[PDB]
Paper text:
Among the >600 human ubiquitin ligases, UBR4 plays a particularly important PQC role, being an essential and conserved E3/E4 ligase found across eukaryotes. Aside from teaming up with various ubiquitin ligases, UBR4 activity is linked to two specific cofactors: calcium-binding protein calmodulin (CALM1) and KCMF1 (13, 16, 17, 20, 21). Our data show that the evolutionarily conserved UBR4 complex forms a megadalton E4 arena, in which inward-facing ZZ-DZB domains of KCMF1 act not as E3 ligases but as substrate receptors. The architecture of the E4 megacomplex is conserved across eukaryotes, but species-specific adaptations allow UBR4 to perform its precisely tuned quality-control function in diverse cellular environments.
Cryo-electron microscopy analysis of UBR4 in complex with its cofactors KCMF1 and CALM1 reveals a massive 1.3 MDa ring structure, featuring a central substrate-binding arena and flexibly attached catalytic units. Two UBR4 molecules dimerize through two remote, structurally different interfaces to form a large ring-shaped assembly. The second, larger interface is formed by Armadillo repeats in the C-terminal portion of UBR4, with laterally aligned helices sealing this contact. CALM1 and KCMF1 bind at this C-terminal interface, as predicted for the trimeric sub-complex. The C-terminal helix of KCMF1 inserts like a pin into a hole in the UBR4 Armadillo repeat and is covered by a small lid insertion within this region, which also mediates CALM1 binding. This arrangement implies that the proper folding of the Armadillo repeat scaffold and its associated lid depends on KCMF1. Indeed, co-expressing UBR4 with a KCMF1 variant having a mutated pin helix (L318A/F319A/V320S) yields monomeric UBR4 protein.
Author numbering:
A (entry chain E): 9 to 57, 63 to 76, 82 to 149
B (entry chain A): 3983 to 4079, 4088 to 4339, 4475 to 4515
C (entry chain C), E (entry chain D): 289 to 296, 300 to 331
D (entry chain B): 3463 to 3647, 3698 to 3775, 3788 to 3842, 3849 to 3982
The structure:
């Protein structure tokens, strides 16, 4: 598996110095069968950063419950452990999406099994693990 | 006007109902008009407002399409589905607008996408299509139609406009690359399509991306197949074709374009020397079915061979090995190509490497196969010269 | 030129609105055409 | 169009030989399959629309919008003609007892009639020797050299007092320069005036496309360079010819509208005049030049290939072939094949198919098998409206014959006619061309009824 | 004129029969046409 990544890195290596530019970073794993997003790309640039082979391999190896916990923390701005419809509306507005009050309420309600009209950490964990 | 959607639906229904008919009268009288309508709708007139005198069309949209999904669905739209209308589609797109902010945006977008996917999977929300383009469609039919050139030009403009954001451009380039094998069947009618393709890969990173996907062996195989067909036709008949060598010329030009830049030239030289050398020899064999296009193809192939044969010792040894490999297949009766191979070897002289690769027995058998002197003076001279060199 | 019937203007803000609407109509037609080329 | 006699004999022999039902079924299947393939080729041809529209407006002989020129259609059978030698002359030189002449180009000479006027008893010619060669030179004195560069053609002896002599050539000769020698018994060395007699020459010749032969290596190099020049010129002319198509399609689109225009040979619609001028005026000239250059290239290629084969054989002589293998290998079987995408050749094949099917249908059993193949619908949908008027009437006759005593076939044909007429008459009110494009269906009905 | 396929007679009694049959066909067509002009 390392051979394909090495071949792609070398093929995208311009000056032959074993290092590439971050402007072409998305194209390297775009050619490998994976499809990233722009936000993913800026996040990957932020995490590491010109990239050499070791950092590229580290990035590829990470292509965890810590991520789910961080997402839950980002969703619950107040830190109260409960995701209200207001918090979801604020998150959607920040992301740029447009939604109705009825649609968001229905989304929250369909995300609750306990009938309390609220999202818990266990509920989000179960929703994420649904296959 | 405000009823534009119904007119567009009529035009698109007529287009898709009459896009697969090969008769030239239908292409000229129905498909061309729908293509022109679609081309006018896709590419609107340049803005005249004082603020927007400079910015292009892409800078004017109030919504931003998603990277890896298509929300518009033509199958339901053509059946007058209220849930797949223009306003419904526009309502599903987001309005155009430190490390922690980047992270938070990343996870919010990702898990909101997952939440929406689950909602569509269990509930009633419509599921967007995936951006994976099929390789057989009406697009190949329209792009190479010999009925009329204007239809090809309009289709080229449409597909050029379809590739603006790189997420769509990747798929568009993949489909166009898949359409590469139509060059031989539709020799001159492809003149437009090529002009589009070269424009879409005019940047270096797109060429490198296509090279990483394995396009160089594809073009090489196409070139060898075309040269073999040319040789077979030359052997049998004596017809004249004013378009002979167009497809081979175009494919060789495309290969040279792929090779000109440094990275793929350095990487892919070890796999392309045999193809180019064999093609050059086979083209040089032509004596009657020879045109100007074939002459230019031979010249460019020779230039490519000269360019690739410059490097370190390992690459020179590999080139010698493949040169002996191509010398092996040629029979013992022809006295032209081995002369070229051996004078090339003596010019590059290396003297002991064929002892390691085992090419000595090849030239020993070459000496053993000579039964005449009048017709084999050049081969004997070059073989003796290289034997004294070695 | 003396016929009255043959003689039977737009501000700037509505010009901006029209250009924007042209942009979204172009984008919608692009996505509609892309939808018909998906793999089946 | 070369296979008229072949299909004639095939139809006759198939009609006269009694055969099993399986052989009849196979034969009918082959005929119908060829017909269907040619119809499919014709209806999808890239130039089919242009030719179909042009047929009813202008009068044109050939199809001058073909990408690959067809050797069969480019090579008609040209007949011999009587040409006076002075009309094709270019340069001449006289000596004491010989005359050397050069022509404009190559010619296939068959007979020479020589006339004598103002003869005197002092001296006349007893033996005339004819010499010819096909090597093009710029100066006559250069070719004046006697022994090496001439070939014997004919020696003719004359009775005393002869006035006209008929030098016949058993095999026609392809010549560019000629020489006449007075062997047994005069001419001015500078001007060529003869006081004893006056000589006039006639030839039974026709224009010929041929090139100089190759004998050595520099001749091969000159041939290669000339062929490259001819290929370049042909490429330029071909591009100039194919550049005419967009204008032709624009004019066709404008003509199809048929808008009335306000203003007797000048009162015809201006767009029709432009169409005729564009097609029959410019495309025809470009096509003729292209055909000439293609013929020259073909002749040069044939000469070069023959020289290469001879040289290879000479080198190898320092394998028996049967009679058919010799023809297959040699240059004899090289120039009798039509291009694959040719409109005229497909039309000719459809004509032959119609003729053969008309011959075959006179057998009742073959008629039943053909109607079982589904020939009536194919003829109704494709060949009723395409071709010359004679072909259309022949197709009508064949369709009438196929239903001679078959109630089912007659019902099928009547159903087709009635359905088309009703469908057209439904929308006749909103479009009169529907009502005016029923002439062939009604003609078919008239022909079927008129035969009791 | 040398084509064989281009060359690919009736007695008197069958001529009489044919003329008679023509007569009855004419009469039948006459009555058929008269049938469409009756009162309604
Ligand atoms: Zn032809």
């Amino acid at each position: 598996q390392i051979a394909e990544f090495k071949e792609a890195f070398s093929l995208f290596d311009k000056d032959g110095d074993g290092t590439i530019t971050t402007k072409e970073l998305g194209t390297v794993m775009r050619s490998l069968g994976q499809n990233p997003t722009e936000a993913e790309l800026q996040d990957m640039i932020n995490e590491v950063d010109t990239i050499d082979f070791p950092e590229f391999l580290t990035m590829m190896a990470r292509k965890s419950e810590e991520e789910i916990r961080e997402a839950f923390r980002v969703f619950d701005k107040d830190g109260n452990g409960y995701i209200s419809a207001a918090e979801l509306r604020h998150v959607m507005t920040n992301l740029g999406e447009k939604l109705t009050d009825e649609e968001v309420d229905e989304m929250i309600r369909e995300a609750d099994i306990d009938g309390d009209g609220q999202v818990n950490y266990e509920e989000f964990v179960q929703m994420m693990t649904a296959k | 006007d405000s009823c534009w959607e119904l007119r567009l639906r009529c035009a698109l229904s007529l287009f898709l109902m009459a896009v697969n008919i090969k008769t030239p009268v239908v292409v000229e009288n129905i498909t061309l008009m729908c293509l022109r309508i679609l081309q006018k709708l896709i590419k609107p007139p340049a803005p005249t407002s004082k603020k927007n005198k400079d910015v292009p069309v892409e800078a004017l949209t109030t919504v931003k399409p998603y990277c890896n999904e298509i929300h518009a669905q033509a199958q339901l739209w053509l059946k007058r589905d209220p849930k797949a209308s223009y306003d419904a589609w526009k309502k599903c797109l987001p309005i155009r607008g430190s490390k922690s902010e980047l992270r938070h945006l990343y996870l919010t977008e990702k898990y909101v996408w997952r939440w929406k996917q689950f909602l569509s999977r269990r509930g009633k929300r419509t599921s967007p299509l995936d951006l994976k383009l099929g390789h057989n469609n009406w697009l190949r039919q329209v792009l190479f139609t010999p009925a009329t050139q204007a239809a090809r030009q309009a289709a080229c403009t449409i597909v050029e406009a379809l590739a603006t954001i790189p997420s769509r451009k990747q798929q568009v380039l993949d489909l166009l690359t898949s359409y590469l094998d139509e060059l031989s069947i539709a020799g001159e009618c492809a003149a437009e399509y090529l002009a589009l393709y070269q424009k879409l890969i005019t940047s270096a990173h797109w060429k490198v991306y296509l090279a990483a996907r394995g396009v160089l062996p594809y073009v090489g195989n196409l070139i060898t197949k075309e040269i073999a067909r040319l040789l077979a036709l030359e052997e049998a008949t004596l017809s004249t074709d004013l378009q002979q060598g167009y497809a081979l010329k175009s494919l060789t030009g495309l290969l040279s374009s792929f090779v000109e830049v440094e990275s793929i030239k350095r990487h892919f030289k070890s796999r392309l020397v045999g193809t180019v050398l064999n093609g050059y020899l086979c083209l040089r064999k032509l004596v009657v079915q020879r045109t100007k296009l074939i002459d230019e193809t031979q010249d460019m192939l020779l230039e490519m061979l000269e360019d690739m044969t410059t490097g370190t010792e390992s690459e020179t040894k590999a080139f010698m090995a493949v040169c002996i490999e191509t010398a092996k297949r040629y029979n013992l009766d022809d006295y032209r190509t081995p002369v070229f191979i051996f004078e090339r070897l003596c010019s590059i002289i290396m003297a002991g490497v064929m002892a390691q690769c085992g090419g000595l027995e090849c030239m020993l058998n070459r000496l053993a196969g000579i039964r005449d002197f009048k017709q084999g003076r050049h081969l004997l001279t070059v073989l003796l010269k290289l034997f004294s060199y070695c | 030129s003396q016929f009255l019937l043959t003689r039977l203007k737009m501000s700037e803000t509505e010009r901006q609105s029209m250009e924007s609407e042209r942009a979204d109509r172009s984008l919608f037609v692009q996505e509609l055409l892309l939808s018909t080329l998906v793999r089946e | 169009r070369k296979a008229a006699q072949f299909v004639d004999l095939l139809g006759y022999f198939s009609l006269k030989t009694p055969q099993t039902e399986k052989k009849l079924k196979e034969y009918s299947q082959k005929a119908v399959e060829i017909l269907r393939t040619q119809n499919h080729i014709l209806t999808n041809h890239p130039n089919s629309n242009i030719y179909n529209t042009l047929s009813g407006l202008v009068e044109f002989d050939g199809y001058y919008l073909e990408s690959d020129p067809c050797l069969v259609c480019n090579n008609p059978e040209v007949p011999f003609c009587y040409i006076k030698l002075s009309s094709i002359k270019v340069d001449t030189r006289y000596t004491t007892t010989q005359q050397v002449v050069k022509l404009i180009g190559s010619h296939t000479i068959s007979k020479v009639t020589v006339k004598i006027g103002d003869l005197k008893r002092t001296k006349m010619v007893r033996t005339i020797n004819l010499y010819y060669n096909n090597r093009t030179v710029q100066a006559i004195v250069e070719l004046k050299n006697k022994p090496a560069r001439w070939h014997k053609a004919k020696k003719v002896q004359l009775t005393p007092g002869q006035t006209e002599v008929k030098i016949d050539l058993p095999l026609p000769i392809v010549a560019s320069n000629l020489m006449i020698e007075f062997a047994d018994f005069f001419l001015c060395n500078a001007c060529g005036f003869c006081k004893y007699a006056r000589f006039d020459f006639m030839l039974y010749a026709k224009p010929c496309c041929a090139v100089d032969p190759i004998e050595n290596e520099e001749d091969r190099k000159k041939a290669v360079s000339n062929i490259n020049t001819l290929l370049d010129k042909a490429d330029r002319v071909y591009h100039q010819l194919m550049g005419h198509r967009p204008q032709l399609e624009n004019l066709l689109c404008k003509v199809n509208e048929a808008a009335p225009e306000k203003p007797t040979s000048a009162s015809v619609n201006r767009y029709i005049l432009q169409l005729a001028q564009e097609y029959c005026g410019d495309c025809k000239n470009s096509f003729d030049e292209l055909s000439k250059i293609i013929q020259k290239v073909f002749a040069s290629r044939k000469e070069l290939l023959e020289y290469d084969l001879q040289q290879r054989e000479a080198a190898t002589k320092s394998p028996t072939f049967t009679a058919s293998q010799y023809r297959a290998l040699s240059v004899l079987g090289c120039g009798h094949t039509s291009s694959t995408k040719c409109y005229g050749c497909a039309s000719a094949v459809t004509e032959h198919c119609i003729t053969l099917l008309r011959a075959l249908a006179t057998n009742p059993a073959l008629r039943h098998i053909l109607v079982s193949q589904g020939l009536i619908r194919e003829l109704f949908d494709y060949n009723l409206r395409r071709g010359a008027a004679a072909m259309r009437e022949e197709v009508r006759q064949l369709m009438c014959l196929l239903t001679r005593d078959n109630p089912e076939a007659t019902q099928q044909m009547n159903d087709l006619i009635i359905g088309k007429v009703s469908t057209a008459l439904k929308g006749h009110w909103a479009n009169p061309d529907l009502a005016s494009s029923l002439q062939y269906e009604m003609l078919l009905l008239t022909d079927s009824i008129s035969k009791e």
